[PDB]
Amino acid sequence: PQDLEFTRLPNGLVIASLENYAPASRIGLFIKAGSRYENSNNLGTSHLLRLASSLTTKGASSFKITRGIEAVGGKLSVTSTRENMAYTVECLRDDVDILMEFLLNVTTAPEFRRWEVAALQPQLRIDKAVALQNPQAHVIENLHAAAYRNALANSLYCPDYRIGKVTPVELHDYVQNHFTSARMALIGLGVSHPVLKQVAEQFLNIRGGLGLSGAKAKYHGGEIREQNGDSLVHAALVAESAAIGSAEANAFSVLQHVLGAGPHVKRGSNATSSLYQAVAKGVHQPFDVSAFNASYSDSGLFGFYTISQAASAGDVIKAAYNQVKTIAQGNLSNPDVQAAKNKLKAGYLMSVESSEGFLDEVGSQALAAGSYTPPSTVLQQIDAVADADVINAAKKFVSGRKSMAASGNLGHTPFIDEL
């Protein structure tokens, strides 16, 4: 009924709210601290911070905090990416107040006790371990660290050698410098904005400029290669995409989809996916491949991902490239761009068809722009992309510094010079 309601304060923190109909409300304070905010000496402290969200803080002991949310059947999720760190908080309409006072403690009153922070430490390994089970995670990670040099090439997961060495002052300093007013965006899905503000005003007023971590962007072509014993091999090939919320970017997104192979059908094969077709024809029976597309504030990464077998690695890899070369040679007919488009549009909508989805989308936008762009407008922007534009962007991959990351038996994985 009532649409969202943004409001930038004097501090510069953003806040939104949507009194929805249904029974479930969810706050989420998104602080601007991603993994790109750590240095050589600070690496792995966001990771630990992410995992220390239930520790004692100034008003609420670790015990109260967890038993408290249990009391009421809430959930407290602490999500992070290379650029941001969403602190989610779900619970029943009637219990938001009990819950909010928890989110506030957790975020503005953390008390990292030597003893408490010390117990955690080992959790990092356990966490890292489970996430590194998906080749995607280590390759994807390795990708970022090869393509960047300084900031976005920092991974999400603590470096093995740092684990036990993440000190209390480190956490306290990261909170202090990054968990600040200018970088924050409140976001409610079932709360009163009037009452939200009040609270935001009372609890979120802290000073801290950007880049006390060492903010800045830079792309650098590089290749990280991980040999294994596994039959299958994964590899990424990516060159500087266009930036976040910019036209070029958007273009990329649309091109992405022309090749992009995320199956829309269970047990179904893509007929739409060029990459898949092309790859497929020159490739063996079992394989899988998809267009990769990343966009961040101050740079992007666009290019594709492959999953071949030991002796097909190259064939696949090249095949994919060649095809994306085709579009950059100009060869791309109108029919396919419009399908792509509609694919993308559909996607975005579904992406925001959920509370959790919406709440992410909103916060996300808060941190980038400073307001909420409605869907419609969104939709218009994507449509504006020119059928040529797409090609043009694609031209850029082929004529853009390469950066690749592979895993598995790498006898048959092309190097930079190979392609």
Partner 1 sequence: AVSASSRWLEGIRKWYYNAAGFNKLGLMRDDTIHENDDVKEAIRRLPENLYDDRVFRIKRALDLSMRQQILPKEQWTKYEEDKSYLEPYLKEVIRERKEREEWAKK
Partner 2 sequence: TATYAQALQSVPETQVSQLDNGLRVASEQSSQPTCTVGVWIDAGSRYESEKNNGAGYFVEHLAFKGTKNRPGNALEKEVESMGAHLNAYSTREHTAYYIKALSKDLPKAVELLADIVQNCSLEDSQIEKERDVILQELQENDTSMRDVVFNYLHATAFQGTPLAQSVEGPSENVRKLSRADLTEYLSRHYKAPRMVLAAAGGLEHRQLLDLAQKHFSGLSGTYDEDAVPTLSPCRFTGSQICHREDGLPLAHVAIAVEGPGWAHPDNVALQVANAIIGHYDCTYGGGAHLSSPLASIAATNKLCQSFQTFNICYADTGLLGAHFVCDHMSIDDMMFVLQGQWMRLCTSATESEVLRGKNLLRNALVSHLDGTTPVCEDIGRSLLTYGRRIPLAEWESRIAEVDARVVREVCSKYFYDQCPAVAGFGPIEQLPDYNRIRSGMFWLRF
Partner 3 sequence: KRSVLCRESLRGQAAGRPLVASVSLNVPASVRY
Residues forming contacts to partner 2 in the complex (CB under 8 A) are: 19-24, 51, 53-54, 62-63, 65-67, 70-76, 78, 90-95, 123, 126-127, 130, 192, 263-273, 286, 339, 342-347, 349-350, 353-357, 375
**Residue 110, φ and ψ in degrees, nearest 5:** -35, 140
| Binds partner 1 by CB under 8 A, chosen from 3, 115, 271, 377 | 115
Q: Compute the least distance from the CB of residue 194 to partner 2, in Å.
A: 10
Q: Per rule CB under 8 A, is residue 374 in the interface with partner 3?
A: no
Q: Per rule CB under 8 A, is residue 82 in the interface with partner 3?
A: yes
Q: Per rule CB under 8 A, is residue 67 in the interface with partner 1?
A: yes
CA-based radius of gyration for the chain:
23
Q: Choose the contact partner of 126 out of partner 3, partner 1, partner 2, none; CB within 5 to 8 A by kind.
A: partner 2
Task: Tell which positions 159-188 bind partner 3, by CB under 8 A.
Answer: none
Stretch that binds partner 1, among 109-117, 199-207, 240-248, 393-401 (CB under 8 A): 109-117
Question: Which sign, positive or negative, has the C-alpha torsion 92, 96, 101, 103?
Answer: positive
| Binds partner 3 by CB under 8 A, chosen from 38, 111, 360, 389 | 360
**Residue 275, φ and ψ in degrees, nearest 5:** -40, -55
Residue 109 vs 195, nearer CB to partner 3: 109
Q: Any idea of the CA torsion for 291, 294, 295, 297, to the nearest 10 degrees?
A: -160
| Binds partner 1 by CB under 8 A, chosen from 61, 150, 177, 277 | 61
Stretch that binds partner 1, among 110-118, 267-275, 334-342, 409-417 (CB under 8 A): 110-118
Which contiguous run of DSSP H or E holds residue 345? helix 334-351
Rounded-to-integer distance, Cα 277 and Cα 150, Å = 37
Residue type, 369: A
Q: Compute the least distance from the CB of residue 67 to partner 1, in Å.
A: 5
Rounded-to-integer distance, Cα 276 and Cα 342, Å = 19
Which tokens in the block code for residue 372?
Answer: 């909420």
Whether residue 365 contacts residue 378, with contact meaning beta carbons closer than 8 Å, is answered with no
Q: Per rule CB under 8 A, is residue 45 in the interface with partner 3?
A: no
Task: Tell which positions 253-282 bind partner 3, by CB under 8 A.
Answer: 253, 256, 260-263, 267, 269
CA 39, distance to chain mean position in Å, is: 20
Residues contacting 253, CB < 8 A, separation 6+: 293, 295, 344, 382
Q: Choose the contact partner of 161 out of partner 3, partner 1, partner 2, none; CB within 5 to 8 A by kind.
A: none
| Binds partner 1 by CB under 8 A, chosen from 2, 63, 73, 416 | 63
**Residue 76, φ and ψ in degrees, nearest 5:** -120, 95
In 3D, which of 315, 302, 309 has the Cα closest to residue 390?
A: 302
Residues contacting 189, CB < 8 A, separation 6+: 18, 20, 24, 25, 26, 27, 355, 358, 359
Q: Compute the least distance from the CB of residue 112 to partner 3, in Å.
A: 16
Footprint of partner 3 (CB under 8 A): 50-51, 53-54, 66, 69, 75-82, 86, 88, 127, 131, 133-134, 136-137, 140, 156, 232, 253, 256, 260-263, 267, 269, 286-296, 304-305, 307, 347-348, 351, 360-361, 364-365, 368
